[PDB]
């Protein structure tokens, strides 16, 4: 629903005004980052299955959670946890290409705290995995897009915890 | 914004954005400042647009100002130009967005009921947007006015 | 094709052309107390405020003064305590 | 509750870094305008009962809202409305002298929207009185302070609506 | 800061702040340029304080870095210089804010329960900031070292 | 095709075409000549890419032409390089259709059972198209390695 | 670099620089803002590259790490992974020069005579670099594939 | 020999590290002035018989170094002296274009102070010549690029003296 | 041409052409039409750029028109226009090739041994062609007078 171009539109809409001078340069600030967000989103989409498989090995394996009793023990749950982590990556590349972090509250963090509390998912192990994921995808996109990617993980990461 | 509906089309099939859509993003952005000066002519001449569009509104359908209708009297005709002001603000958003989804989220998805519950016939409204079509495209060079004409005509097709 | 070894000292032992001949800079690294102090996250934007005011003691319980009554023969120190009784028991102003 | 000094010290604290020159030029920017801030507090505190009274005189009374059927008809609701407008004036000076709108976000804009729905007071007439107030201070405190003063008035209007 | 500490002092009594308190703000900001000049030379000499005040500490008290002590090893000596490096960051924070309150709200609430649990002697960590005081005042001039040294003395005063 | 991706989405919501979708077709038409000539040099190099692809396959994965593999004997490898020719048969209109979906009809929706039903390992033919990946884009221009290599990512990721 | 051999080609004729190669210097320095962006991506994922280029090498030629081979041992691979780690340092030097003489003066000239002496096979270290080429071009997009793979090509064709 | 890119590679090669964020701004300061130096060389070469003309016109002509009791006097020694001044300008074009004075220290400053005592030509007039060449050049090219050309002029004058 | 300078730059070291060098050729093709627009502005405005700038040379150097010098009023100053017209013809040969060598091989290689045998000051030709290209840069634009500016200044530095 809420984009970045729509954000300066909808703030201008409820005033009933038009595109003012401050509303244009903020809108042109999104275009100046336009080559960065497109080129980084091609890089993550080409390396989706490798940025996931490093992030689970960096934080989650060889612990209590991959042993019996842990929440990623069985082959249902460890195959679920890759998919349940891969939605955090794919929607974060939506929020970079949108340029606004409000796509996460519409479609990721809505009932997510109510699920994992009812499921017995360790939220603090999830937020450790996304925090390990945020470092390794900063090395694949460079330091310019690494700040813009690094914001939108920690909008997910504070919605969990 | 085109970056809205190119996400929700990729979110509908649980997919990443295809590189056949990534060049639609990038070529929108680098040509995005072209859309700014198109929209600056709209807000730069909004009083010019609203004056010489409502005159031919009462020439192709000259009976809305007649009594027994809605827009008879000074206050009641002023709600038409109050509602004519509410249209071209969205098409100013519609030029800049690249998609027509600010016009979808604000000003079309209840017009089919909210006007016949108010007393304004849509076939008179659809003339009033196309009366603006003859003057808003005329206030811009026809290369840049061709794609500028390619947004509010969707609203007339969504009225008719 | 060849050059006398005394002549190579004339060519390449200058100040400008010495870094390509032998080692010259030898950078000491960051000392280990500095790299133990970074939060392994060198950049952060909006979530600065998410770690700032949003730590769990809502810095309203350490930022607020209390009122004693040691000064009963003082008069202006009495008057701001009586308002503090009014603004904690009824906790609006009682003026209206 | 922050400051121009505190929200740069603590913002550099939680990053773990020392005082950058970009943080230092923000710190000296507040230090240049300090005589503007301390003089603006004294003028607003002088005629605070007077500076409310023109702002009600333009926007609210001799209308339907003083007439019965309005919200602030009775004398309890009229005297509360001056007091509920006094907080918007007074905490804006605390928002001005700190150089940060975090006074408003912690103890003005916490639950202000739900209280106004629960009481039947119109939000839109309140914020219209604030725009009556934000001009009458600018013709009274001076030119330079009133451009700074109205910004924290607009932080209320960005939150109330 | 003194601006934060005087707003909330005036917020509980719920009136505009007095000119006796406003003049203390005016003396704070007019002396604001000098206190950044105290801090910005300490931050530029950040590495060449902690390496020497650490080496003055272990020479003065050797049982800490000795084996069997807490800070034995190249890792444990390095993390027991960050415990000195963290206080030099807060002292430069307290110099900018003018008061000791960004140290009192950060550094020294529960040190006697922290280092009792961690095993380091609290008497020895108060010796290191005394070595930090004797290093940093030598790197500052004659007049300005007295106002910087009071915040060094409060840190030793909180641990002892 | 890219026109198919728009006019079944507008068919579902019983609507006309949005002009944000219509400029995706307009940018497709201008980029048709850049797209068709990639397939023209793919059709010229038809009997080139397949030859070293088996040499990239069989030197890394020699188990198929070892005794104990499905592609054993010269009759079976002559059909096996013919089956890799079928995937290059599929690819050279993927850079005409603009996107995946004719590969999605004819290449990937039965491949996980049929190669399993024909006794072959599915990873080896998934290796044979990603070993084809390096020797196809390097045989063409440097800018269009992202274009012609885009539909190779679907052929890798569906089998593997 | 381009500039350090456009000098020498102009110095040995004792001429000033022709304006044809002054275009070549001027086009080089405005390409400097994007070539270092390739090198920051390359050094950011060196441990993702070197671990993966080891495992793509040792599956291909398993004789060198099996005992009886030269890289046999727990630590002898750790030098031999380091001996392949050096070519990732030089290719990032060759990326930011736009050239291949920092590859040449550092990692080419006597590389046949080292590994003849130490005993490692000279093609077996070259097959690691093309294994490193397949992962580092998979790190980047299409327009950085040929610009990085050209310097990868020159180190392969010199050693082999 | 080496230039501003080759040296900062060779400064970061012999440490064994990669190109860090402490050496990229050495390249980024070079690439920002990359377009400035190429316009500086193309006005040197168009005026290269006039920069050497105006340099000797302020120092050597009409003096008594070109008297018959003088060093310059025979026209064999004149045309060498313009050419021995040609080779100070042309390499100063090179080091400004390279951004590093290493080409000066290999070929110009090879044995030049020990040739001149072996010949008998004065050194104290040569520093007067190149410092007269410096004030002609910075007026012709521009006060930006005349500053960076003035370093590589005086680097020869540091080596002669 | 810039194609022709590129091959002999690669043939001296016996090499195929670098893909960074083909970027200079591919940029030359897409900017090939712009240089033809540069050249027609010179040939169209030839009769105002020659008689004016030659008169600027005669105002800067009035030695030329006076008897005893090289020129004289009836045709010798007229034939110093056509000997100046040849170089403007050679610049237009040079800018459409993107290369220096059409200025070189027709009108540089033996001009000193020519004009000593002809009895003109070669430096006055260089000051005359400096007066020619001072007004040529102000003719067309400020953008196109820079990369055509790089071929103007070479002939100044070829006469002296
Ligand atoms: C006056 C411009 C408008 C108006 C106001 C009106 N407000 C109130 C009541 C309240 N306002 C507050 C708000 C705050 N109290 C605080 O301490 C702070 C932080 C400093 C804020 C922002 C509260 C808490 C109340 C009332 C709750 C209570 O009384 O317990 C009223 C009174 C409503 C009533 O029914 O008593 C009125 C009338 N009304 C108008 O018509 C003007 C538009
Ligand atoms: C070769 C790289 C791999 C391999 C190939 C192999 N295939 C066959 C026989 C068939 N393969 C197919 C598969 C397709 N045919 C198609 O037209 C398409 C595109 C639409 C596909 C994916 C089919 C239908 C056959 C049957 C014969 C036919 O082509 O119609 C064999 C022979 C097996 C046999 O029993 O005869 C072989 C060896 N096998 C490998 O090991 C490689 C991985
Ligand atoms: C952007 C979203 C949006 C829409 C869709 C909208 C419609 C809209 N049109 C209205 C009135 C009106 N609308 C018209 C309509 C017209 N005048 C004519 O003569 C023509 C026939 C026709 C349009 C070309 C008239 C005459 C009134 C006044 C009706 C009345 O007062 O009863 C009103 C009530 C008065 C008001 O504007 O506050 C609304 C809400 N307002 C919005 O903010
Ligand atoms: C007896 C039942 C009971 C418990 C357990 C309890 C806990 C409790 N922990 C608190 C704070 C806290 N609790 C923690 C603890 C932790 N944070 C971490 O990161 C670690 C994972 C963890 C400890 C190892 C911290 C750090 C605070 C400080 C809040 C602040 O930042 O201001 C607070 C608020 C202030 C305080 O009283 O300290 C309560 C009330 N209260 C109770 O009545
Ligand atoms: C800014 C406020 C702040 C403080 C005060 C702080 C203290 C602090 N010191 C620690 C460790 C430590 N601190 C020391 C320090 C010392 N050992 C000695 O004996 C000397 C007396 C002394 C230094 C002069 C040592 C050795 C450890 C490691 C404890 C251990 O490994 O047993 C730790 C646990 C590991 C770590 O995070 O470093 C904390 C949290 N951290 C903070 O963020
Ligand atoms: C940047 C220029 C540069 C080069 C070329 C270089 C090569 C290099 N490789 C070495 C060793 C080695 N290199 C290898 C390498 C391999 N073994 C294999 O089977 C594989 C084919 C291959 C790598 C994938 C091995 C096993 C040794 C140890 C040789 C021994 O100890 O006998 C050593 C000796 C160890 C040392 O001095 O640190 C050098 C100097 N060093 C440099 O600084
Ligand atoms: C860049 C590398 C390079 C260098 C270093 C170079 C130096 C150079 N300058 C020289 C001579 C000379 N240098 C001067 C010096 C001057 N002219 C004057 O009249 C002034 C007094 C003074 C400078 C202001 C003179 C007069 C000679 C000729 C000496 C002679 O012929 O006896 C000579 C002796 C050549 C000869 O006389 O046959 C050499 C080698 N040539 C080069 O290519
Ligand atoms: C494109 C390569 C090219 C060049 C450059 C060229 C030059 C050229 N310049 C010439 C003459 C001349 N050039 C001049 C020029 C000058 N006298 C002055 O006072 C001025 C300083 C100066 C020029 C501005 C004069 C006076 C003559 C005639 C000389 C004579 O007739 O004795 C002539 C002899 C007559 C003729 O055929 O025009 C040639 C061939 N021919 C070529 O093929």
Short mmCIF file of C-alpha atoms in Angstrom, two decimals, chain G residues 52-158:
data_model
loop_
_atom_site.label_atom_id
_atom_site.label_comp_id
_atom_site.label_asym_id
_atom_site.label_seq_id
_atom_site.Cartn_x
_atom_site.Cartn_y
_atom_site.Cartn_z
CA UNK G 52 33.93 -21.97 -2.46
CA UNK G 53 36.80 -21.80 -4.95
CA UNK G 54 38.67 -24.36 -2.88
CA UNK G 55 35.80 -26.81 -2.92
CA UNK G 56 35.24 -26.29 -6.63
CA UNK G 57 38.92 -27.02 -7.21
CA UNK G 58 39.45 -30.02 -4.99
CA UNK G 59 36.50 -31.91 -6.41
CA UNK G 60 37.89 -31.37 -9.90
CA UNK G 61 41.51 -32.37 -9.21
CA UNK G 62 41.40 -34.54 -6.07
CA UNK G 63 44.95 -35.84 -6.43
CA UNK G 64 46.68 -32.77 -5.01
CA UNK G 65 45.02 -32.95 -1.58
CA UNK G 66 44.89 -36.74 -1.38
CA UNK G 67 48.23 -37.85 0.14
CA UNK G 68 50.91 -38.40 -2.35
CA UNK G 69 49.90 -34.95 -3.57
CA UNK G 70 51.52 -31.65 -2.81
CA UNK G 71 48.78 -29.95 -0.81
CA UNK G 72 48.28 -32.85 1.59
CA UNK G 73 47.81 -31.96 5.23
CA UNK G 74 45.66 -29.84 7.49
CA UNK G 75 47.96 -26.84 7.30
CA UNK G 76 49.30 -27.48 3.80
CA UNK G 77 45.88 -26.72 2.37
CA UNK G 78 45.81 -23.63 4.58
CA UNK G 79 48.87 -22.34 2.79
CA UNK G 80 47.50 -23.56 -0.52
CA UNK G 81 44.21 -21.80 0.07
CA UNK G 82 46.31 -18.78 1.01
CA UNK G 83 48.34 -19.25 -2.18
CA UNK G 84 45.03 -18.96 -4.07
CA UNK G 85 43.92 -16.12 -1.79
CA UNK G 86 46.72 -13.96 -3.18
CA UNK G 87 45.25 -13.96 -6.68
CA UNK G 88 42.05 -12.50 -5.29
CA UNK G 89 44.16 -9.66 -3.86
CA UNK G 90 45.77 -8.99 -7.22
CA UNK G 91 42.61 -9.11 -9.30
CA UNK G 92 41.21 -6.39 -7.06
CA UNK G 93 44.43 -4.55 -7.79
CA UNK G 94 43.86 -5.24 -11.48
CA UNK G 95 40.25 -4.07 -11.30
CA UNK G 96 41.12 -0.66 -9.87
CA UNK G 97 43.94 -0.10 -12.32
CA UNK G 98 41.80 -0.92 -15.34
CA UNK G 99 44.82 -2.82 -16.53
CA UNK G 100 46.77 -6.05 -16.14
CA UNK G 101 50.27 -4.88 -15.30
CA UNK G 102 49.68 -5.14 -11.49
CA UNK G 103 48.74 -8.75 -12.23
CA UNK G 104 51.87 -9.00 -14.39
CA UNK G 105 54.50 -7.40 -12.16
CA UNK G 106 53.29 -9.26 -9.07
CA UNK G 107 51.67 -12.55 -10.01
CA UNK G 108 52.71 -13.70 -13.51
CA UNK G 109 56.37 -13.30 -14.35
CA UNK G 110 58.16 -16.07 -12.53
CA UNK G 111 55.14 -18.20 -11.67
CA UNK G 112 56.34 -21.11 -13.76
CA UNK G 113 59.63 -21.24 -11.89
CA UNK G 114 58.17 -21.18 -8.40
CA UNK G 115 55.83 -24.11 -8.76
CA UNK G 116 58.42 -26.09 -10.68
CA UNK G 117 60.60 -25.65 -7.61
CA UNK G 118 57.97 -26.19 -4.91
CA UNK G 119 56.41 -29.08 -6.80
CA UNK G 120 52.79 -28.07 -7.23
CA UNK G 121 51.46 -28.56 -10.77
CA UNK G 122 51.11 -25.35 -12.71
CA UNK G 123 47.77 -26.16 -14.34
CA UNK G 124 46.25 -27.26 -11.03
CA UNK G 125 46.64 -23.77 -9.62
CA UNK G 126 45.24 -22.41 -12.89
CA UNK G 127 42.12 -24.54 -12.56
CA UNK G 128 41.41 -22.94 -9.20
CA UNK G 129 41.32 -19.51 -10.81
CA UNK G 130 38.71 -20.54 -13.38
CA UNK G 131 36.90 -22.13 -10.45
CA UNK G 132 37.29 -18.75 -8.76
CA UNK G 133 36.07 -17.10 -11.97
CA UNK G 134 32.81 -19.06 -11.93
CA UNK G 135 31.88 -17.90 -8.44
CA UNK G 136 33.07 -14.27 -8.63
CA UNK G 137 31.16 -13.64 -11.84
CA UNK G 138 28.16 -15.17 -10.09
CA UNK G 139 28.61 -12.56 -7.37
CA UNK G 140 28.08 -9.69 -9.80
CA UNK G 141 25.58 -8.60 -12.43
CA UNK G 142 25.88 -8.77 -16.22
CA UNK G 143 27.80 -5.56 -16.90
CA UNK G 144 30.47 -6.47 -14.33
CA UNK G 145 30.90 -9.99 -15.68
CA UNK G 146 33.16 -9.18 -18.63
CA UNK G 147 34.95 -6.34 -16.85
CA UNK G 148 35.99 -8.69 -14.05
CA UNK G 149 36.38 -11.83 -16.15
CA UNK G 150 38.85 -10.23 -18.55
CA UNK G 151 41.50 -9.97 -15.85
CA UNK G 152 40.57 -13.47 -14.73
CA UNK G 153 41.25 -14.59 -18.31
CA UNK G 154 44.74 -13.09 -18.37
CA UNK G 155 45.90 -14.91 -15.28
CA UNK G 156 44.60 -18.22 -16.67
CA UNK G 157 46.23 -17.87 -20.09
CA UNK G 158 49.60 -16.87 -18.65
#
